[PDB]
Ligand binder design. Sequence first.
Ligand SMILES: Nc1ncnc2c1ncn2[C@@H]1O[C@H](COP(=O)(O)OP(=O)(O)NP(=O)(O)O)[C@@H](O)[C@H]1O
Ligand SMILES: Nc1ncnc2c1ncn2[C@@H]1O[C@H](COP(=O)(O)OP(=O)(O)NP(=O)(O)O)[C@@H](O)[C@H]1O
Ligand SMILES: Nc1ncnc2c1ncn2[C@@H]1O[C@H](COP(=O)(O)OP(=O)(O)NP(=O)(O)O)[C@@H](O)[C@H]1O
Lengths: 311, 311, 311
Amino acid sequence: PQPISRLEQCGINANDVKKLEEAGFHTVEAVAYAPKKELINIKGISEAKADKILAEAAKLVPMGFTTATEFHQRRSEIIQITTGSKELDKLLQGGIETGSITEMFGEFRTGKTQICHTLAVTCQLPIDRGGGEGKAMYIDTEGTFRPERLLAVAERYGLSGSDVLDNVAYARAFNTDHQTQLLYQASAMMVESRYALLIVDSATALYRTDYSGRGELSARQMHLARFLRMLLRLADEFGVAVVITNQVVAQVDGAADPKKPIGGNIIAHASTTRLYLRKGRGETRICQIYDSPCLPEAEAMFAINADGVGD
Amino acid sequence: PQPISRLEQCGINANDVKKLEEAGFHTVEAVAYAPKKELINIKGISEAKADKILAEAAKLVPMGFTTATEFHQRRSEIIQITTGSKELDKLLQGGIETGSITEMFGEFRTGKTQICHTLAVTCQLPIDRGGGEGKAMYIDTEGTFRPERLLAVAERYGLSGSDVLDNVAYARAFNTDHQTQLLYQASAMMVESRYALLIVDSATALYRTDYSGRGELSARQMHLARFLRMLLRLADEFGVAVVITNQVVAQVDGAADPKKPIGGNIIAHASTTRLYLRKGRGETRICQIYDSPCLPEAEAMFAINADGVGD
Amino acid sequence: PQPISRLEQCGINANDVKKLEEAGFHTVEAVAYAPKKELINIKGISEAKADKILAEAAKLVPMGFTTATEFHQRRSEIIQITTGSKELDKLLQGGIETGSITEMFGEFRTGKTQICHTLAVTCQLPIDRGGGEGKAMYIDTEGTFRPERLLAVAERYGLSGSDVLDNVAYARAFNTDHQTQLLYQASAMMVESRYALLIVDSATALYRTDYSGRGELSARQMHLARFLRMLLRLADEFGVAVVITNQVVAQVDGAADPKKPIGGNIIAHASTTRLYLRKGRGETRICQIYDSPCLPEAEAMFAINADGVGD
DNA sequence: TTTTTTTTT
DNA sequence: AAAAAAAAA
Ligand SMILES: Nc1ncnc2c1ncn2[C@@H]1O[C@H](COP(=O)(O)OP(=O)(O)NP(=O)(O)O)[C@@H](O)[C@H]1O
Ligand SMILES: Nc1ncnc2c1ncn2[C@@H]1O[C@H](COP(=O)(O)OP(=O)(O)NP(=O)(O)O)[C@@H](O)[C@H]1O
Ligand SMILES: Nc1ncnc2c1ncn2[C@@H]1O[C@H](COP(=O)(O)OP(=O)(O)NP(=O)(O)O)[C@@H](O)[C@H]1O
């Protein structure tokens, strides 16, 4: 939450600063987490300038060794937002954390985008209810976003729907490259008001249709790695929350399970957490954890009512 | 364990010594293992000064031929720390050695960072239990570090959790270049109190996202070689232990196994040891050795309980 | 095997001789193979003195034309040491020769250092078994040397392990320049007792991490050429044997094989022989010749048992 | 002369 | 069962 204007200090030119602004950098911490080469490659910058700049990023953000205790005390206050249902709150142990990346595993009709809606509204609850009190931006990439459902959840939690829709900064990606511009604009929007959550329904879906590899493929992974790193660039700074929804890739000639998310290893190593969603009978659905260091594997039911997620 | 102040002797200027301090050198042995050119390139140093300096490094640290017997007698006392479970102690033949580099091979959900936690606590056990009695520094590079698990292992071994967390010098890298500064600061911290273990979850992960080669690539390997050499600079001096966790790179158009760690040859040649981790059913996991001169290939189960590694 | 004291003759001053001793020269033949300029450049020497000196080197060592027959008769007695397994003895046609330089081509886990161990012990066998009866010096440069394995081979050949370890003059290089001092000390040790074999695991490995060229590079090759020439200076005098282990450099944008040893041409032209080692299934490994004038290309299996090299 | 990266259905 | 393609120091 530290604007570059604070770096408009110690002899840096304000127009040099406004050169820096155009990189999509807008906070001192973003400069602190910027690799030297990215900062060099942009034109009109001698490396010594970067010595000054990075010296200032160190000047504001400490980057040394830290006690495990202090880290624990800073871990004490992560919000971990409620999902809007109890059993998920038990699975996730209080729900999805801020400052992290999450994952929807499903085949279809698993209510993953549904959960994205309910989270999108429930971030706006007062913190006592677990909401981050943070405006929510929703990067849809299939156009499947439904305001009507947001009004339904608005009925569900008693807040006026108009207030809910006043936030929820919907955006509609098409090109794989477009998502990048949407990220830089996101970072541009982060400066003004503490947002709660980024959601992405199908970060991966564009990558199937565009990169018919291999390939390709080696380019596809090449792009995803940067995308996910940028998501870390946001999440490591402004908490809020990162949600990723993945289409599924069914194996052939496997054993006994015919699933696994597309995107290969690079997605898998990146996410702090992972989830998997099998349909039950009727509305009922089954969550099941993968790859969360915080938690033992667990599984649970939830119905998708008119209010969606519940019991 | 020999501070440069001992080299504040034989006519070397104390301010020349304090020029040397800034190189990240802080021990006489580090000077002894310093190549001539690195010592020259830093400003304010005539080569004759380096003749004096190196003459003193020889003056304190012997560097001649040695009997195999003597080397055996010095090999007799390496701690090789317990992993916190018996079957791993059998695989590794008493567990991970001090003075060496180690490797986690996994795809995801293989509990490699898990093992990093349990080691991070178990270094603090009394030596009879195999702990090096050495403070542990943990260079995380995905932010996935969990103090809570350290408290769990603290329950597991009966030591108070607060004492465990009093050490564990967590540090949070972002830039690829940042890891270097964290290394020099590490070497700076080595002087004060004998540490047990360096851990790095993902030394390699930054290198994917930053160097989208080739490339690049030729620069990426160029950087990794120095990084690993520095890890040798630490490990060859202060024992403790070096742990490396590697994301995986799945082959395409191979035969029959679709794995191999990224980083290419340069990582592979460097490590004294190597490990590989396939998930079993349930919590159970399978370790399997690569590239350990000390040991025949072997493999074994272990569950990841609430206490993590065990049976 | 001719000490400089024999040159303490024909009017040369004994203190001039003891000036010469400091050059790392310790044998008359070394003086005979010394280029005029190296001998001049060292201080306190007029060129006429070098006329005397070289005249004496000619006075003891003949350096004229020789019949091919005589050379054959002197080729008749080269030991070519057994490798400790039969099929390698067939490939190498009786095993590695004395008076020569050899090469390990591998990617990792190819058992090259393993073979270095078994050779290191098997030089000590009586000559009927092919051992040179020569003490062995082992210049490790990754610290990976394991006395335990030497004890294992000692079990393998029935000689007491303590006697084996009584030799095996282990030495631990770090700097690229350090290897040079280790060479001059080696030559200093050659005078006292006929050694069998020099081994070097990774002559090349330091050169990657230190010279991140190009460069550099032009300096790197500049150093390697001298290093290899010195290895010839030893090998051309005292037989014994020279073994070189090379890390691998995988090509990009090649055809169909993604290998070749680092060090470029200068290593390649130097070695009398060359070997290449592909892993087989299980312990089994595959040797394959390069660049041996003596031999047609061939290839063969060998297992790496608890006793290492065998069948 | 140096330097491997990538899964889909 | 069966599927390529990718530089720059
Ligand atoms: N009006 C409704 N009444 C009851 N249940 C509903 C209603 N609308 C949606 N649902 C539930 O929500 C699900 C919607 O599928 P969902 O999995 O949320 O979309 P998705 O996972 O994104 N699949 P995709 O089309 O690829 O985006 C339906 O299968 C129902 O279970
Ligand atoms: N609360 C818990 N209860 C039981 N098992 C757990 C719990 N938390 C973590 N685990 C186990 O630990 C694993 C964590 O994955 P792990 O492989 O340790 O992370 P990772 O290898 O670093 N993958 P990455 O996300 O790329 O860092 C889970 O898959 C579970 O097997
Ligand atoms: N105890 C053991 N039992 C069986 N086989 C073993 C044992 N110890 C070592 N080996 C074998 O020896 C190999 C050691 O690798 P090796 O190629 O000899 O080291 P290296 O080639 O020098 N690689 P590097 O680490 O870069 O030095 C293992 O891969 C095994 O095949």
